Design a binder for this molecule. Structure first.
Ligand SMILES: Nc1ncnc2c1ncn2[C@@H]1O[C@H](COP(=O)(O)O)[C@@H](O)[C@H]1O
Ligand SMILES: Nc1ncnc2c1ncn2[C@@H]1O[C@H](COP(=O)(O)O)[C@@H](O)[C@H]1O
Ligand SMILES: Nc1ncnc2c1ncn2[C@@H]1O[C@H](COP(=O)(O)O)[C@@H](O)[C@H]1O
Ligand SMILES: Nc1ncnc2c1ncn2[C@@H]1O[C@H](COP(=O)(O)O)[C@@H](O)[C@H]1O
Lengths: 310, 310, 310, 310
């Protein structure tokens, strides 16, 4: 199986690295405006492969995405000193109007996997531009945060993260929604499991966990200037779900008909991921306070969209 | 890490095979009354190891269980033509009174993992005989059936089995309880997920799934005379949980203070499994009809116990 | 990819179990003259898959073989205490005369992988009956003995087994030839390297190792009645080689035009194994004594074949 | 087991990422002069672990190294466009003069694994400063070039890379020596085997391959400014070797008493790597020309060391 990556920067190369080390696909093609950057990365990683799995990593052009089952969109421009967040965005939407036609013309059956920040806005742009069914354009969204959430709860509960079912929904960023109300652990409600364990879960415990999840990205960016190891591996996992037609449940961003009262917007909700992308959406139970944050989250996004032409 | 297996028959050797192929432990010691059977098995499997993982598989005696972190009890005698189920049992309880002291004298810190059928009665015998804390003696119980249950639901729902949380509780056998009432899929109740999918789940669907789970063991036994591949791999998974202090949730059999109104009995309930065995029990929600079957199940067992001296 | 297995006893079933546990193929079809046996093994194995890899194991007829990339031929008769080498051969030959045509009708394009003892002569009849090109029919042959030979030499020298290059060639059995003369370790002559590590191989060392290798199968059979755990994993490796078009080097059995003067006979030589079966032979340096041993080995196999009419 | 990493830039961080993704160790501690960088990389990586293996990645000080079985030394200075080979060396030497003492105070019993360029001279200073026995300080050296050499030869011959035995020796850099003369494939002389497959290595073939190997790092650096993806996985393999006491053969750098007449210098030779670090050397056959190339290589490294006072 072949997999493509457009934008061979930290995020794109880190995704290629994770795919290689995990032996997810047998072939990975990197594409970038800076051809020598993409070649340098391909060969750097190729140097790794004999110490992991046989994976053919190379750099090429769009035409070389031919036969790819999924193409990661990790392309984007560098933030200018004194530039708004609103113009950085516009520029990237411009990059994407260039990239999407060129991807789908070479690889008309590929699922599109959006990585470039802000993931939800960029996921919408990509959906509009593709003209494909809504399930074919998937954004990484809040997967990392959902896993962080579960990890912290598992830590607190002295249990395996695998038995913790909790979600982070909505906008990947500071307004994302941690779904405390309906999270389960070992098939039973969070709080009941917590107390049959000697660990109520004080409002102060919840604040610590919410910070742990909510501000991770920010702390990472503050310390090294950008995130990529995490998403690299998250994306690899999503590619795996696609290639193996896994139909596993993931909090990923996609174009939604409606959510919490808002129409036609891309945000994270637990979705069934497989061969053709996302075929089906789970709708977890929300507290009034939780769904109010979700719609407010949905509000912000869907207006950012229109106000960019998408 | 070292792991021991007492009873090097189909079940014990198949467990050793699964441990080897999966590279769960670095060393596996087999023990059997028939020394040459155990040696033959160890070396047969050792022939396999270069095609999987470096695992030192050998045959020895009880003293050779020294340093084992877990010891599988897969020992048992062959059914006699014209013998009751009640006397086959008695004989095995006799085998176990021999085996348990000898295991724990060589390996005083090992977790005991019971395999020999009937698992719940044999798990009780082993608990009584050990004199160890209740969490140190774990039976495979209904793990296979819990996984079968989840697999069939996942099949029906066109979803990944990993997102299906459902339990089979109680007595490993024809009176086991499939917990339909409170099963979840992707963190939401089974039936709500089923309908937001176009698949109500008719009483006829439930009957098909219940047969699929309930009678698998019987069909297998009917066709080749005994089950071992399944439990082999199930046991390997339990050994893994122990060795990695995973604290993962498994429907395994253990001595319980109380369950559905019955006191001091070994049966399957979802339990946290780790370094010292099982440290904690989940209590899933049950329908009135479900808990009535659980107690009736508990009834049968706990009397089989006393009536055997354990 | 689909793998077929014809002959679902201990050899065929362990193979399928090993395929499942290692996640070599997505689908494994079991075929046996005893239909309920195959079905029982299939369900027993399917019970294990949740504890390893998503693998679809099921039992069916010869037609259910359609599209299989490789077919393991493990069908044969129950041994009879007292019967000769040649008597058993006559019976299994009789079996392949039924099985082979049926496989090729259903999956003409499958690589045939022969496992049934004596594997060298059985490979010879599978090949003659198949009318396939010579590389598309391959017996497991001597692979387990080659691997044990490397392991014992690695133990003696205190190095990883992967560092050791040595072969056992010819008949899978008493006459097989350990190639001491040109054995390498980390790319250098074994004797030289052994002496450099300050440990020249005494005749007694050589003697103990030969025994360890050549008489392994004998001990397993005396102790438990048959071998299967070993070959199951070796066979799974061979299947993997074929599915992934590895072009790996394996001492497997195949029809060979001439060897040490003996003409048109099937035995193990190091061969390159990939998607079409074998496609290339490696000729290690044989001392004069080893060539004579090989010649003698080939002559034994050639006479056995001739008496059956092959 | 705990692995330490000192120097948490692109080389140190990819290493940790590769350790995490491959599940080599349970704990990886990151140490950097820039504390928020290390913390950021640690959290970025921790974000990936749910999509791979339970690995605890965190950032701390030198004391947090206590109990580490191996420590990766990847600390160094930012390159300066225009600076010489010797200038950069002087700066990194200065760095190890601070780092080394601090590591040995905290984890005296850790195998030191050197990564910082130029790795051969840096290994030399780590060794002299450490006062450790010679095998307990090991540089990554030439491993990536050895592996690329095998891959290109395997591609040319159309065989699996595992079948190919060949080494690159000496300086990790321009003077490194590809050992054509005694290269083996499947245990036989490469030239002979190449000709047997009907494909003798033309001078142009040899020429293209040398280039492919020797100038890989150069291209990666021109295209993206530094190498790290490759060495990260190579280093993770070396750590694995040490943690598991593999006694595997690797072309890694270490202090060597004499080589081709050059005395007391660190360079890559094939070495046996296990729990104490390296403990044995393998001496491949060098043609007269290769010996001269090696001699020349060793002399270059020895002069560089001497000018720093080592
Ligand atoms: N139109 C485009 N097509 C492909 N790659 C692009 C395009 N525009 C920018 N890039 C690359 O996207 C990458 C973003 O890097 P990073 O933000 O570090 O992941 C950079 O390597 C850019 O060269
Ligand atoms: N006291 C005992 N200690 C160890 N192994 C035993 C004992 N009694 C019976 N066994 C073995 O337990 C195995 C049960 O085989 P199976 O029922 O096929 O798993 C047989 O191989 C017996 O030899
Ligand atoms: N003509 C045949 N077609 C298919 N399977 C067969 C045939 N003859 C024997 N077998 C099976 O081959 C298997 C041999 O088992 P084992 O020798 O234990 O690997 C048994 O399960 C037999 O039923
Ligand atoms: N004395 C030191 N102790 C610890 N880390 C250091 C020291 N000097 C430099 N480093 C780090 O070494 C790393 C080199 O990064 P790179 O060359 O990209 O692998 C940088 O993160 C530096 O901060």
């Amino acid at each position: 199986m072949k997999v493509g990556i457009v934008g061979s920067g930290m995020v794109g190369s880190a995704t290629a690295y994770a795919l290689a080390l995990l032996g997810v696909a047998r072939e990975v093609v990197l594409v970038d405006l800076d051809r020598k950057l993409a070649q340098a990365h391909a060969e750097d990683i190729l140097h790794a492969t004999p110490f992991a799995h046989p994976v053919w990593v190379w750099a090429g052009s769009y035409g070389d995405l031919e036969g790819a089952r999924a193409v990661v969109l990790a392309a984007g421009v560098a933030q200018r000193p004194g530039e708004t967040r609103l113009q950085l965005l516009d520029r990237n939407a411009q990059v994407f109007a260039q990239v999407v036609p060129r991807v789908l013309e070479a690889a008309p059956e590929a699922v599109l996997l959006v990585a470039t920040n802000p993931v939800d806005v960029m996921t919408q742009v990509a959906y509009a531009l593709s003209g494909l069914p809504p399930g074919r354009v998937v954004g990484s969204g809040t997967i990392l945060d959902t896993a962080r959430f579960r990890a912290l709860l598992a830590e607190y509960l002295r249990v395996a993260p695998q038995s913790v079912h909790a979600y982070v929904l909505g906008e990947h960023g500071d307004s994302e929604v941690l779904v405390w109300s309906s999270a389960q652990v070992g098939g039973v409600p969070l709080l009941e499991f917590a107390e049959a364990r000697g660990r109520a879960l004080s409002p102060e415990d919840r604040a610590r966990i919410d910070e742990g999840v909510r501000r991770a990205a920010y702390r990472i960016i503050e310390g090294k200037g950008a995130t990529y190891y995490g998403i690299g591996a998250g994306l690899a996992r999503l590619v795996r779900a696609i290639l193996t037609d896994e139909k596993g449940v993931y909090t990923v961003s996609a174009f939604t008909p409606e959510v919490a009262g808002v129409l036609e917007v891309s945000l994270s909700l637990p979705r069934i991921l497989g061969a053709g992308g996302v075929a089906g959406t789970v709708y977890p139970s929300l507290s009034p306070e939780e769904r109010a944050a979700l719609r407010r989250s949905a509000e912000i996004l869907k207006e950012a969209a229109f106000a960019l032409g998408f």
